[PDB]
Write a protein that binds this ligand. Structure first.
Ligand SMILES: [Zn+2]
Ligand SMILES: [Zn+2]
Length: 529
């Protein structure tokens, strides 16, 4: 598919630089009358195809040469796949206004300090409007698995856009602030031309359970526990922490946070008023072991089995302050992100060896998702009634599911646009269509440089998982064998090819050891001259 032409004056162009064919690094660029508005700037964490890499960024080459045009960066909420790449954007232009709610802006402040950046903040709350050049924005309360999420209406001259952010429709969130479906319904009456809609759970039928179903289950588990209780969850889910604390306090226990991410984030949550707990209900971690075990609940990180997490360390008998016993109850108040199963089940099995009881979502209602199920999205589609629909935040199977949901409410199929990263969507005179594609790749972060690591380097790293045998005589290897005498049978055969007189040395003994190995050992390490 070809690149798009110029954008008809007065129209609007929408393009994702990440987040559409995958879960992660969401970044969406809106173009209008030469100016730019960006909604979200997240990272993607690397998989097996990307060894040695730290982060994956949205493809910023597409704004690198027009950074002067960006009017603002607007942020739905504070999860890493929406804010993680902000330091790299601000390194390109440090004074881009950054718009968001108080809790969101607190997280990017802390993230941007790691890179020695001080953002220009414009702080925003639901119900408020702000102007950013040719763009105007209005913010709608969203309930999600993290406080202070916001959905965003963008008004230009081309019409009205609505971006949901990560959206869910819990009608009884513990914090009593459900998503503002009324307000978005009234905006639908106004006429919304384009709806950008979270697809994460679009293939799950029905309506998802309330986050408030978790509290009673945790209360039941703590009441029945004879010893200490340990609850692992995500530090960003303040309403989950609040329910753990409320259950523990209601049963005469005190609470302790374990792990830097948990300690830092609950500090922010307490300061901004999202977490309400009395100082006498908290114990410092280095003083929790002084009390009776049945008097403490520990709240930790490490739901994903990351080896340096607090719960991993505890499961191996290598936590400084805490030692686990068969009398402990461990609750994984979370779900298993795909690609982490081997690691999570390893921690569970180390805990089972010790004799501790482990409770996961598979056995009890200890976790709910933060994204709307298909039946909740239907409420959104009937409430907003968008003239056109673009699914975002999802892989193809999710984007397609969301497409059908919108179709089944009456959105014409020609008005349901599926635009992968790099595919533009033009909204012109009220009609919306796909207009062309540019290529987008994965920008890698590996330490202090970036951009010198690419397909060939990852290929070499993948090959090197069988070690390497290097010739340039002295034979050496590293990921190959523990037998020192294993190099010798190749030394004789190397000189033999060296009695040959007539870079061709490279392809000469590199081909000579390669035959010796794929014959003696039937291994295939990398051979380097
Ligand atoms: Zn999120
Ligand atoms: Zn997300």
């Amino acid at each position: 598919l070809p690149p798009p032409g110029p954008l008809t004056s007065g129209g609007l162009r929408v393009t994702a630089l990440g987040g559409i064919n995958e879960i992660g690094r969401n970044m969406t660029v809106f173009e209008h009358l030469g100016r730019l508005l960006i909604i979200d700037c997240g990272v993607l964490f690397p998989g097996h195809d990307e060894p040695g890499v730290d982060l994956i960024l949205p493809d910023m080459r597409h704004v690198e040469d027009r950074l002067d045009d960006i009017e603002a960066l607007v942020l739905t909420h504070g999860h890493e796949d929406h804010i993680g790449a902000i330091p790299f954007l601000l390194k390109l232009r440090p004074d881009i206004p950054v718009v968001g709610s108080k809790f969101t802006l607190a997280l990017v402040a802390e993230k941007c300090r790691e890179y020695r950046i001080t953002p220009v903040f414009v702080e925003v709350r639901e119900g408020q409007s702000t102007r950013h050049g040719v763009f105007e924005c209005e913010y709608f309360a969203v309930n999600h698995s993290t406080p202070d999420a916001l959905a965003i209406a963008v008004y230009t001259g081309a019409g009205t856009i609505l971006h949901t952010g990560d959206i869910k429709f819990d009608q009884l969130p513990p914090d009593g602030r459900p998503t503002d479906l009324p307000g978005m319904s009234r905006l639908g009456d106004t006429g919304v031309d384009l709806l950008l809609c979270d697809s994460t759970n679009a293939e799950i039928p029905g309506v998802g359970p309330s986050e408030s179903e978790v509290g009673p289950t945790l209360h039941r588990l703590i009441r029945g526990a004879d010893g200490r209780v340990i609850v692992a969850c995500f530090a960003s889910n303040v309403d989950r922490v609040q329910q753990i604390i409320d259950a523990a306090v209601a049963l005469g226990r005190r609470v302790s946070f374990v792990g830097r991410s948990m300690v830092r984030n609950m500090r922010v949550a307490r300061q901004l008023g999202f977490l309400r707990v009395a100082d006498s209900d908290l114990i410092d971690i280095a003083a929790a072991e002084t009390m009776a075990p049945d008097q403490v609940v520990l709240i930790t990180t490490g739901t994903q089995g990351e080896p340096m997490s607090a719960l991993s360390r505890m499961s191996r008998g290598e936590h400084r302050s805490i030692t686990l016993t068969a009398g402990d109850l461990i609750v994984l108040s979370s779900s298993l992100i795909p690609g982490n199963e081997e690691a999570v089940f390893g921690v569970i099995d180390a805990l089972s060896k010790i004799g501790a009881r482990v409770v996961t979502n598979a056995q009890a209602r200890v976790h709910v998702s933060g994204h709307a199920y298909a039946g909740e999205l239907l409420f959104l589609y009937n409430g907003v009634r968008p003239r056109n629909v673009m699914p975002v935040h999802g892989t193809w199977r999710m984007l397609r599911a969301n497409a059908k949901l919108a179709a089944s409410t009456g959105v014409p199929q020609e008005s349901i646009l599926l635009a992968e990263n790099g595919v533009s969507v033009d909204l012109v005179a009220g009609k919306a269509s796909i207009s062309g594609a540019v290529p987008v790749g994965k920008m890698f972060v590996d330490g202090l440089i970036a951009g010198d690591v690419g397909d060939i380097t990852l290929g070499e790293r993948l090959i090197l998982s069988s070690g390497f045998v290097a010739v340039t005589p002295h034979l050496h290897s590293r990921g190959f064998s523990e037998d020192p005498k294993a190099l010798e049978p190749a030394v004789r055969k190397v000189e033999a090819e060296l009695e040959s007189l007539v870079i061709r040395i490279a392809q000469g003994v590199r081909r000579t050891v390669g035959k010796w190995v794929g014959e003696t050992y039937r291994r295939q390490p990398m051979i380097v001259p």
